[PDB]
C-alpha cells in the first residue's frame, strides 16, 4: 500500500508524502523541491542522520509509515 512520509524543512511545514514503498525517493525530493521552486542541488535531504541517495527508496532505507525526512539548505560559499 501507500506509505506516509513526513517531510519538514526549517519551519512549521508538515507535508505528507503518500508514495509507494518502491517509489524512488529521488522523485520525492524533486517533487518537494519543484513545489518550492528551487534546484535539487540547492538543498539537501537527510533520513534521521544519513543523507538520502539519488537511488534510495522507502523500502531500501527501511522507512516505516509516518516517518520523518529532514530538509536542509546548501551553504552559499
Amino acid at each position: 500500500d501507500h506509505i506516509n512520509l513526513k517531510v519538514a524543512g526549517q519551519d512549521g511545514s508538515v507535508v505528507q508524502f503518500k508514495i509507494k514503498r518502491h517509489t524512488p525517493l529521488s522523485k520525492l525530493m524533486k517533487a518537494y523541491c519543484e513545489r518550492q521552486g528551487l534546484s535539487m542541488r540547492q538543498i539537501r535531504f537527510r533520513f534521521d542522520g544519513q543523507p538520502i541517495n539519488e537511488t534510495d527508496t522507502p523500502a531500501q532505507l527501511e522507512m516505516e509509515d509516518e516517518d520523518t525526512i529532514d530538509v536542509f539548505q546548501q551553504q552559499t560559499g
Partner: peptide, 12 residues
C-alpha cells in the same frame, strides 16, 4: 503549521 499530502505513482 501546514499539512499537504502528495501522491506519486511510478510505473516499473
Amino acid at each position: 503549521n501546514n499539512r499537504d499530502p502528495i501522491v506519486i505513482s511510478d510505473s516499473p
